[PDB]
Amino acid sequence: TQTLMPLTERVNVQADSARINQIIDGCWVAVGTNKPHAIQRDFTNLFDGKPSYRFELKTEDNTLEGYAKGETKGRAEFSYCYATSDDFKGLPADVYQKAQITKTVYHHGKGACPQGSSRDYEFSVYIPSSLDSNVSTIFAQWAGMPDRTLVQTPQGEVKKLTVDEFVELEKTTFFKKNAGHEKVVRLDKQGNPMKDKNGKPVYKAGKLNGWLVEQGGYPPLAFGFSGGLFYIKANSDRKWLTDKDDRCNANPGKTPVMKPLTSEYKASTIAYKLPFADFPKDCWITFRVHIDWTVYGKEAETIVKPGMLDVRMDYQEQGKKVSKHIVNNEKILIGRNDEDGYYFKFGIYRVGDSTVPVCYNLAGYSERLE
Ligand SMILES: O=C(O)[C@@H]1O[C@@H](O)[C@H](OS(=O)(=O)O)[C@@H](O)[C@@H]1O[C@H]1O[C@H](COS(=O)(=O)O)[C@@H](O[C@@H]2O[C@@H](C(=O)O)[C@@H](O[C@H]3O[C@H](COS(=O)(=O)O)[C@@H](O[C@@H]4O[C@@H](C(=O)O)[C@@H](O[C@H]5O[C@H](COS(=O)(=O)O)[C@@H](O[C@@H]6O[C@@H](C(=O)O)[C@@H](O[C@H]7O[C@H](COS(=O)(=O)O)[C@@H](O)[C@H](O)[C@H]7NS(=O)(=O)O)[C@H](O)[C@H]6OS(=O)(=O)O)[C@H](OS(=O)(=O)O)[C@H]5NS(=O)(=O)O)[C@H](O)[C@H]4OS(=O)(=O)O)[C@H](O)[C@H]3NS(=O)(=O)O)[C@H](O)[C@H]2OS(=O)(=O)O)[C@H](O)[C@H]1NS(=O)(=O)O
Numbered sequence: 001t002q003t004l005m006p007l008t009e010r011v012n013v014q015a016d017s018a019r020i021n022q023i024i025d026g027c028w029v030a031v032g033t034n035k036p037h038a039i040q041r042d043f044t045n046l047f048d049g050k051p052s053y054r055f056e057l058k059t060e061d062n063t064l065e066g067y068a069k070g071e072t073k074g075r076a077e078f079s080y081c082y083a084t085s086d087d088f089k090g091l092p093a094d095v096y097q098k099a100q101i102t103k104t105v106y107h108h109g110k111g112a113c114p115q116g117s118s119r120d121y122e123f124s125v126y127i128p129s130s131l132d133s134n135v136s137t138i139f140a141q142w143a144g145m146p147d148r149t150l151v152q153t154p155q156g157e158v159k160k161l162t163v164d165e166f167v168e169l170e171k172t173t174f175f176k177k178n179a180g181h182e183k184v185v186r187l188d189k190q191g192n193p194m195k196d197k198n199g200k201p202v203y204k205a206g207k208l209n210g211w212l213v214e215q216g217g218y219p220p221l222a223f224g225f226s227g228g229l230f231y232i233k234a235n236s237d238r239k240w241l242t243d244k245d246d247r248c249n250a251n252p253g254k255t256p257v258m259k260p261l262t263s264e265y266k267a268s269t270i271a272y273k274l275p276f277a278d279f280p281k282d283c284w285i286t287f288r289v290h291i292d293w294t295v296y297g298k299e300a301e302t303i304v305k306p307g308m309l310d311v312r313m314d315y316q317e318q319g320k321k322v323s324k325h326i327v328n329n330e331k332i333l334i335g336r337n338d339e340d341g342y343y344f345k346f347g348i349y350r351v352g353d354s355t356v357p358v359c360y361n362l363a364g365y366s367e368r369l370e
């Protein structure tokens with residue numbers, strides 16, 4: 001009988017549409033390392049009558065680089081936002097091709113909410129007693145959607161390029177995350193141009209050429225464990241073009257609850273914290289999250305209207321129903337000053353250059369209006 005079933009298909013949501021065989025349970029796509037044990041359907045642990053999702057990253061499963069040199073991180077998550085082939089059906093072939101280049105493929109897919117909207121989210125997590133108290137992982141996060149056609153020229157001027165102008169720039173610039181490098185033709189030992197799986201030319205990253213594109217950035221909301229604490233962290237970035245060098249980020253252990261750490265353009269708030277030992281183990285915990293996203297002033301870079309965060313934590317204890325109003329309708333700055341909105345993800349995002357093993361289950365996602 002089936003116990004655990006590995007779900008190994010992975011999708012690059014920013015640069016590729018998901019194929020039908022990669023979609024999980026009709027509403028998810030997986031991102032991160034493809035190890036069989038990374039993500040598995042779990043028939044031994046049902047949530048609401050359906051097999052749950054078991055996530056696991058062993059000590060050597062980090063495959064990503066952090067912002068600081070040498071630092072690493074790991075990822076095995078599900079994204080509720082992705083585009084499918086049906087999303088591009090009927091359109092000229094170049095729409096999808098340009099979307100791959102601008103890495104905005106998922107802008108054509110379902111799963112994201114608009115800027116400044118009000119939404120309800122719900123999901124459940126199961127933390128086994130085997131989880132080490134000192135893990136450094138985010139198990140649920142709401143990510144932003146920056147459009148890289150917003151760039152900074154070598155001079156330092158911020159400019160919103162058209163898709164075609166960005167395509168033009170991309171022809172001479174190789175982007176490593178948000179930083180532009182001279183696009184160098186990659187040759188083999190015999191100085192011959194290298195191709196890939198589809199016979200498409202391959203390139204290399206030369207020296208920095210001064211260009212920067214909007215990319216990355218802290219997730220506006222994250223649920224996780226760090227420094228022996230369960231915490232909920234909200235982030236706000238009002239700058240039109242995000243500055244990745246501004247590392248304004250609240251420390252769960254050192255930052256007081258609901259007292260935002262701020263820089264000129266960012267605010268990072270620890271909305272709630274709890275000792276890891278007090279987080280219920282070996283049972284399903286359901287979080288009901290309501291978010292009123294902060295409204296930003298675009299080019300003006302102003303906070304037009306503050307946001308709002310509300311969180312309820314429900315679980316069974318002593319056979320009794322428990323519901324903790326852990327974040328009580330708190331006015332807060334939450335979101336990013338972008339044209340597009342946000343999407344949900346859950347699973348494992350091991351950060352802080354940690355390699356402590358992580359394993360837990362997630363299930364029952366739902367979102368609605370309010
Ligand atoms: O290619 C290659 O390489 C290769 O290939 C092949 O070969 C293979 O592959 S396969 O697949 O085939 O196999 C391999 O080999 C490879 O691949 C691999 O790799 C690659 C590359 O990588 S690298 O890394 O190298 O680059 C890859 O690819 C890539 O990547 C990917 C990924 O990543 O995934 C992608 O990307 C994309 O996507 C993503 C995701 O999404 S999805 O949807 O898909 O999922 C995106 O995003 C990202 O991420 C995000 C998230 O997740 O969130 C973000 O991040 C961020 O945020 C975070 C968090 O926050 S919070 O608020 O929550 O917290 C952070 O973290 C944090 O923070 C930190 C800091 O700050 O740092 C910390 O804090 C701390 O510290 C600080 C500082 O201090 S000092 O001292 O230093 O001063 C302080 O202040 C404070 O206080 C503290 N705190 S405590 O508490 O600690 O005390 C913290 O901690 C943390 O956390 S916590 O929680 O703890 O808090 C971060 O940071 S870091 O550092 O970590 O980094 C952030 N970041 S940033 O930058 O922003 O800053 C974002 O958004 C992002 O990131 S990034 O990095 O990425 O940016 C993105 O965006 C996208 N991009 S696009 O372009 O697309 O758009 C893709 O694909 C790519 O990218 S690219 O660019 O390249 O294109 C791949 O994937 C792989 N593959 S595998 O398989 O291997 O895996």
Ligand SMILES: [Ca+2]
Nearest residue numbers: 240241337338
């Ligand atoms: Ca922006």
